[PDB]
Amino acid sequence: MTFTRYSRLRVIAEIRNIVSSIEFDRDDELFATAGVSRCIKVFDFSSVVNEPQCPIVEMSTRSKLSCLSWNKHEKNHIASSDYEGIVTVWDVTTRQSLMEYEEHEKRAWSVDFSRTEPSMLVSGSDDCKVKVWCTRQEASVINIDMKANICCVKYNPGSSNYIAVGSADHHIHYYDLRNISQPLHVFSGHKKAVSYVKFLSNNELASASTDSTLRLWDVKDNLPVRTFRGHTNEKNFVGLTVNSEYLACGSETNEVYVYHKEITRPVTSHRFGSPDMDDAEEEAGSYFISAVCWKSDSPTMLTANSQGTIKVLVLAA
Amino acid sequence: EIRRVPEF
């Protein structure tokens, strides 16, 4: 029943370079995109779905962007991490940078605003440090020296005391920020760098890696659960988004994949740029999906690829 | 390459 509830992704809207990050605001009303074009763009979701297209805010940045995270309490605030290492908090109504955190010494691949302590945000960098910041303070409040490049950091959705850290050392380091001498647990299983970590719930953590797998982990009992396979991801950040039941990720075949958390093989997938009639130009391997984001626990998702095309997709029977 | 994931 679960495997067969949905068999396809329907395209319900399309905006037609690399988009590194696509994220919904606190209420799933606006979404923002950012990437190599050094421009944070904010769109109204309903307008995109209903109309035959223009962002409502554009904020120019000095450096290429790697990640966005909206504040979970302050509707109008969004954080970005950039390739200079700067972690910026922006106000999308005034367009101003509210904070410019400059301690990282190399590109910051990831930033995440906490859901439960919403002034707290965490970043990770090629400088091998995890930094925790508070929007009321200019200096970092916690620093973890990880000794390998950090590709992704994510707060637990139920408590700001726990973060998952995906590392180029192939492991997920799960920290209690109240005692950083050692992580609570380090999860091994991926055979390549861990590019994303995202929580389905307080106790369920998912990861993506350039070993062409996603993995599901139990962070209450510190157990491996399941490995998901089907997509191609051997090189790039191709996006990971999860909700209470589903995982979605990109692929280096210009395809989005969806998995139900209980089944190791995809429930469906969607090709960007499938040829029609006599089309005979670039092959599928020439583009990658670069960012994905569920609309909370619904079957609706945002997706973007390395050409800059954005699609709103919906799981359907 | 700008989105290449690092290896240790």
Side-chain angles (χ1 to χ4, degrees), chain A residues 253-270:
Chain A
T253 53
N254 209 20
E255 293 167 323
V256 180
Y257 283 74
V258 174
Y259 299 90
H260 188 276
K261 71 181 184 186
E262 290 170 350
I263 293 301
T264 65
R265 305 174 188 161
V267 293
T268 189
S269 59
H270 169 74

Side-chain angles (χ1 to χ4, degrees), chain A residues 64-244:
Chain A
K64 298 177 184 174
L65 305 152
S66 186
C67 191
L68 298 173
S69 183
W70 290 89
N71 194 285
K72 277 74 184 173
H73 186 77
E74 292 287 353
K75 163 82 165 170
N76 305 319
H77 297 180
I78 189 173
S80 62
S81 57
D82 73 32
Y83 280 69
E84 183 179 348
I86 310 299
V87 176
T88 307
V89 180
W90 302 87
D91 186 319
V92 306
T93 68
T94 66
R95 285 76 155 172
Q96 302 309 293
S97 62
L98 294 175
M99 297 296 275
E100 295 177 8
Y101 294 118
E102 304 196 351
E103 300 180 6
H104 285 295
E105 297 180 297
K106 307 285 180 303
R107 61 192 62 186
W109 288 116
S110 186
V111 61
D112 190 45
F113 258 125
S114 167
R115 184 166 301 282
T116 60
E117 196 180 359
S119 66
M120 303 306 297
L121 61 157
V122 63
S123 58
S125 168
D126 268 351
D127 71 4
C128 305
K129 303 180 188 328
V130 173
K131 291 177 180 283
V132 176
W133 315 91
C134 169
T135 58
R136 297 183 293 274
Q137 298 176 63
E138 283 176 317
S140 58
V141 296
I142 303 173
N143 280 268
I144 311 176
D145 181 359
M146 295 295 301
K147 305 172 184 280
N149 309 48
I150 301 310
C151 302
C152 188
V153 292
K154 200 77 173 69
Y155 275 108
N156 187 284
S159 174
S160 67
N161 290 319
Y162 321 111
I163 56 166
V165 180
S167 177
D169 70 7
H170 307 181
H171 312 308
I172 299 138
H173 304 243
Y174 192 56
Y175 275 92
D176 186 335
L177 291 174
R178 297 166 297 184
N179 181 0
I180 60 163
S181 296
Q182 282 292 326
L184 287 168
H185 195 76
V186 178
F187 293 95
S188 292
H190 284 297
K191 312 316 174 195
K192 296 271 288 294
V194 180
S195 52
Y196 297 84
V197 287
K198 294 297 180 75
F199 293 85
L200 291 76
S201 70
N202 291 339
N203 296 337
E204 296 168 289
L205 175 66
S207 56
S209 169
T210 48
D211 66 3
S212 293
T213 73
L214 315 181
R215 290 168 188 256
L216 180 65
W217 313 90
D218 170 354
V219 299
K220 177 177 166 180
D221 291 319
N222 295 325
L223 301 176
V225 182
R226 188 162 298 109
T227 304
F228 305 86
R229 288 181 173 91
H231 64 286
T232 298
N233 180 201
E234 294 291 305
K235 52 180 70 179
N236 293 331
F237 288 99
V238 298
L240 174 66
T241 182
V242 310
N243 62 22
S244 70

